[PDB]
């Protein structure tokens, strides 16, 4: 059934910077050793990202607005974050889509979900075994269903710093939920590590759903059969905006760098001259725009 | 450098649509029949 | 000048499910339109000639006469039923109840719209009310988006209960009778959507592949992309989601073979400067080159 | 939407999707009846 965690500290909504993260492949065309200018919905460099953590009394799984697509980063070491729910009303009045790893398969289901206000998986620290839990109470109008090949997720709390940075970009357009993903090894104690990592397309789901809000799916670690606990994990959310980027394709055809043309006058000059290197001097740029 | 840059920008300008659906002649001729292809190719010819 | 022809389509053996799509036993309502993915098949649509007659057939982004020579990426079929008068609304840039609240096509739609009269099976003497459409909504749908919610609607945009005077249920039932006029008769609509020459494809036209010829000027057709050039083995490493490669000029300079998965570089046939030396046509007709 | 179903609806000089965001000057409505075959004739450049 749907269980509620009581005496939870409210989310702090701490703010951090995105650095140069969030770039993904704009199309399916192979390019190499080239600078490519493209206008699309990108996460602007050094934009505000809101952090949500699971630690101690914090179980941060609020409803977060979708806006025009999001960038979602997860820093973890024990696979706490398992998926997302995307929808509009976040109840059984409208269609919703759940994307989740249930420790043996990747499941994507679009239906009328009677979503639980506090949906989570359950993992027992005693022997690192996941117990059946509830993400939704019912579902009747499923329009899309997908289950991936079987695997085995490594359950159980682990010590040390956050080791895995998993990045995703979600964009709803023309009846398609585009999901780009990427992985990175890190050794960060807290915060969003600075860096660059191009995200590759992994899904283009034909959902045809009105998506305005989403809620992350996490796993709780109950110490006793009637009490709830948490393991350390963090995730960060940022918002995409329409903007122009100059991407760099290297010899193997991988995006290794990008310039955000709207960040500052220097970036605008770089995008105008189509080069990452500018010589010494004075250059005319765009007239002051408001 | 001026000579080389003029030639290289001439090469790069081939990627610019000139109001046509695409800058790739083969793509146009593969998707469109004689008449609509003629319209798009006329735009490209004017531009180039 | 090219002397040989190379045609390379992927290994496809089955016919596309024309009978499952265009000859399905039931069709959805337009508000609850259903989408179906199509992959790994031959789109030999001439088989439809013997079974289906289409009142409306309109293609966007592609010429009707090129369909037999192409391969299609991300092929989807959207199926539903509308009124005859409403068929005109299934097209980009339209307005009306259907295009506003039920089914919206993108401005840059690539694909085709097929509609055919279905009076005999979808209409009854008593009147068939199974098909529905949304008549009220706070704002218009986005392209290819669906809204199957059924909540009471109030023009003031506040919670609603059916009995109230300013309260309406937002779904209306088409009434299809046999004796109805042509504008009030049921029409089945299938919208096929796809991309053409920028990504891997598994649906291909009924064409015959030939052997791969290399180091010779040929007329090539790779997955529907036609051209003239010389094909050579390539050192490029394409990702699984990449099918074509382009240079700074946007010219298609590489391609993955649909059958062997080999990466091949494409080069122009024509190359090299030529000049003619003449002493004057009046003096002689002999020239050096 | 609730009362009238239109077999023909064609707009010139303006896109149908922008009508809700405009104000119209010197609006006139001409009304008449014709044959079905003749409806196609109600359009610029027609003969008959
Ligand atoms: C859609 O879901 C609602 C419940 O509300 C939805 O789910 C919640 C968990 C939250 O996320 C809400 O924001 C969300 O809208 C269903 O309505 C509920 O149905 C149940 C089962 O019939 C009702 O339980 C009964 O209620 C009374 C006592 O309260 C007695 O009849 C019974 O003893 C029994 O408890 C419940 O009251 C009702 N309302 C709520 C708020 O839960 C709704 O049926 C469902 N629609 C479907 C399945 O089509
Ligand atoms: C989304 O789910 C809802 C809820 O299940 C579906 O609505 C239900 O649809 C069924 C099938 O049409 C209805 O049953 C029929 O309803 C009327 C009753 O007068 C009548 O046609 C039949 O006797 C039969 O009972 C059912 O009432 C209805 N339920 C509710 C609560 O509205 C809906 O169809 C689903 N939507 C889609 C797009 O699948
Ligand atoms: C996706 O779903 C959401 C949630 O259902 C839709 O948001 C809703 O949008 C409508 C129309 O804009 C809003 O109704 C109108 O709002 C104001 C008053 O608030 C006014 O214009 C009208 O009186 C009317 O009430 C509605 O409030 C709003 N709901 C929420 C919860 O934000 C959204 O439109 C849907 N998107 C698409 C593309 O269909
Ligand atoms: C991005 O957010 C910051 C605020 O983040 C603060 O620091 C975080 C570490 C965390 O503790 C957050 O909860 C804090 O709020 C904004 O910085 C300030 O924003 C206000 C409001 O606009 C502005 O008046 C101040 O000048 C800003 N400067 C400082 C030093 O706080 C920042 O503006 C946000 N960015 C955008 C684009 O809105
Ligand atoms: C990617 O290609 C490189 C060689 O290209 C250079 O390095 C790229 C990363 C990029 O910066 C290009 O612009 C450069 O021109 C490969 O690098 C070697 O790969 C081999 C295995 O194939 C490995 O043993 C070597 O250590 C690598 N390093 C060097 C200096 O050669 C690289 O493997 C390619 N990536 C692959 C194959 O995944
Ligand atoms: C596509 O199939 C070809 C051909 O192999 C099969 O046998 C043929 C006689 C015919 O029945 C085909 O439809 C079958 O698929 C495969 O081509 C292989 O590769 C070489 C060239 O490298 C080709 O000349 C050989 O005939 C084939 N050799 C084999 C099959 O051992 C090709 O690999 C298949 N591609 C895919 C993606 O399945
Ligand atoms: C994760 O979800 C998958 C998909 O639902 C589960 O595998 C399915 O289990 C159901 C119920 O027993 C079977 O009917 C399906 O045939 C299974 N589908 C497969 C294997 O593709 C899987 O058991 C779940 N893992 C958990 C809950 O740990
Ligand atoms: C009020 C009469 C005079 C016209 C008002 C002024 C300007 C033009 C306004 C609207 C034109 C569209 C009329 C309705 C047809 C579309 C509805 C449908 O597709 O069903
Ligand atoms: C006389 C037969 C050969 C044609 C004569 C030569 C040239 C073409 C001339 C006329 C074409 C129009 C024919 C009538 C159709 C329009 C009348 C209508 O809209 O009702
Ligand atoms: C792991 O612990 C759970 C909880 O007590 C128990 O049910 C299970 O049998 C244990 N062993 C496993 C899952 O191998
Ligand atoms: C659909 O297929 C069946 C079985 O082959 C065939 O009899 C029928 O004619 C087809 N559809 C229609 C509308 O006739
Ligand atoms: C076309 O359909 C008719 C009528 O059923 C049938 O006799 C004929 O064999 C069919 N032809 C082909 C080529 O399928
Ligand atoms: C639309 O017309 C129907 C049929 O007369 C009526 O019941 C309904 O109230 C009308 N709706 C509106 C919004 O005027």
UniProtKB/TrEMBL annotation, chain A:
<feature type="disulfide bond">
    <location>
        <begin position="111"/>
        <end position="142"/>
    </location>
</feature>
<protein>
    <recommendedName>
        <fullName>Spike protein S1</fullName>
    </recommendedName>
</protein>
<feature type="domain" description="BetaCoV S1-NTD">
    <location>
        <begin position="1"/>
        <end position="273"/>
    </location>
</feature>
<feature type="disulfide bond">
    <location>
        <begin position="261"/>
        <end position="271"/>
    </location>
</feature>
<feature type="glycosylation site" description="N-linked (GlcNAc...) asparagine">
    <location>
        <position position="141"/>
    </location>
</feature>
<feature type="disulfide bond">
    <location>
        <begin position="2"/>
        <end position="116"/>
    </location>
</feature>
<feature type="glycosylation site" description="N-linked (GlcNAc...) asparagine">
    <location>
        <position position="127"/>
    </location>
</feature>
Automatic annotation (TrEMBL), chain C:
<feature type="disulfide bond">
    <location>
        <begin position="59"/>
        <end position="112"/>
    </location>
</feature>
<feature type="disulfide bond">
    <location>
        <begin position="16"/>
        <end position="41"/>
    </location>
</feature>
<protein>
    <recommendedName>
        <fullName>Spike protein S1</fullName>
    </recommendedName>
</protein>
<feature type="disulfide bond">
    <location>
        <begin position="217"/>
        <end position="269"/>
    </location>
</feature>
<feature type="glycosylation site" description="N-linked (GlcNAc...) asparagine">
    <location>
        <position position="282"/>
    </location>
</feature>
<feature type="disulfide bond">
    <location>
        <begin position="71"/>
        <end position="204"/>
    </location>
</feature>
<feature type="glycosylation site" description="N-linked (GlcNAc...) asparagine">
    <location>
        <position position="50"/>
    </location>
</feature>
<feature type="disulfide bond">
    <location>
        <begin position="160"/>
        <end position="167"/>
    </location>
</feature>
<feature type="glycosylation site" description="N-linked (GlcNAc...) asparagine">
    <location>
        <position position="23"/>
    </location>
</feature>
<feature type="domain" description="BetaCoV S1-CTD">
    <location>
        <begin position="14"/>
        <end position="206"/>
    </location>
</feature>
């Amino acid at each position: 059934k749907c269980l509620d965690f009581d005496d939870r500290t409210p989310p702090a909504n701490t703010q951090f910077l995105s650095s140069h993260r969030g770039v993904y492949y704009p199309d399916d065309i192979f390019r190499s050793n080239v600078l490519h200018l493209v206008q699309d919905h990108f996460l602007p460099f050094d934009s505000n990202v809101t952090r949500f953590i699971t630690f101690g009394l914090n179980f941060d799984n609020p409803i977060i607005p979708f806006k025009d697509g999001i960038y979602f980063a997860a820093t973890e070491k024990s696979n706490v974050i398992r998926g997302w729910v995307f929808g509009s009303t976040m109840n059984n009045k409208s269609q919703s889509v759940i994307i989740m790893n249930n420790s043996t398969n990747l499941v994507i289901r679009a239906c009328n979900f009677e979503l639980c206000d506090n949906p989570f998986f359950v993992v027992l620290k005693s022997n690192n075994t996941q117990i059946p839990s509830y993400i939704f109470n019912n579902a009747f109008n499923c329009t899309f269903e997908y289950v991936s090949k079987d695997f085995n997720l490594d359950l159980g709390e682990k010590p040390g710093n956050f080791k895995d940075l998993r990045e995703f970009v979600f964009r709803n357009k023309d009846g398609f939920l585009h999901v780009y993903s990427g992985y990175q090894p890190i050794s960060a104690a807290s915060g969003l590590p600075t860096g660059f990592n191009a995200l590759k397309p992994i899904f283009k789901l034909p959902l045809g759903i009105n998506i305005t809000n989403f809620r992350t799916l996490l796993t709780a670690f109950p110490p006793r059969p009637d009490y709830w606990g948490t393991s350390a994990a963090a995730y960060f959310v940022g918002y995409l905006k329409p903007t122009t980027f100059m991407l760099k394709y290297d010899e193997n055809g991988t995006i290794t760098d990008a310039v955000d043309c709207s960040q500052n006058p220097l970036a605008e000059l770089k995008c105008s001259v189509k080069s990452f290197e500018i010589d010494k001097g004075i250059y005319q740029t765009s007239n002051f725009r408001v | 450098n001026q000579n080389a840059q003029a030639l290289n920008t001439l090469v790069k300008q081939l990627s610019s649509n000139f109001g046509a659906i695409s800058s790739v002649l083969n793509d146009i001729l593969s998707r469109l029949d004689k008449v609509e292809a003629e319209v798009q190719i006329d735009r490209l010819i004017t531009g180039r | 000048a090219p002397s040989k022809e190379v045609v390379r389509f992927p290994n496809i053996t089955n016919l596309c499910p024309f009978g499952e799509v265009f000859n399905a036993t039931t069709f959805p309502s337009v508000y609850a339109w259903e989408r179906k993915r199509i992959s790994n098949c031959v789109a030999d649509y001439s088989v439809l000639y013997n079974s289906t007659s289409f009142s409306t057939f309109k293609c966007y982004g592609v010429s009707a006469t090129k369909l037999n020579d192409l391969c299609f990426s991300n092929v989807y079929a959207d199926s539903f039923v509308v009124k005859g008068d409403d068929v005109r609304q299934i097209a980009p840039g339209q307005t009306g109840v259907i295009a506003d609240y039920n089914y919206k096509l993108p401005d840059d739609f690539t694909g085709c719209v097929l509609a055919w009269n279905t009076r005999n099976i979808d209409a009854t003497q008593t009147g068939n009310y199974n098909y529905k459409y949304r008549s009220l909504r706070h704002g218009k749908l986005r392209p290819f988006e669906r809204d199957i919610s059924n909540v009471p609607f109030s023009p003031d945009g506040k919670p609603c209960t059916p009995p109230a005077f300013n309260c309406y249920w937002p779904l209306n039932d088409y009434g299809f009778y046999i004796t109805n006029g042509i504008g009030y008769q049921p029409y089945r609509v299938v919208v096929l959507s796809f991309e053409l020459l920028n990504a891997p494809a598994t649906v291909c036209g009924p064409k015959l592949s030939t052997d791969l010829i290399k180091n010779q000027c040929v007329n090539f057709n790779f997955n529907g992309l036609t051209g003239t050039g010389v094909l050579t083995p390539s050192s490029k490493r394409f990702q699984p989601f990449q099918q074509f490669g382009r240079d700074v000029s946007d010219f298609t300079d590489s391609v993955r073979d649909p059958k062997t998965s080999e990466i091949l570089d494409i080069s122009p046939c024509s190359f090299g400067g030529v000049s003619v030396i003449t002493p004057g046509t009046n003096t002689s007709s002999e020239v050096a080159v």
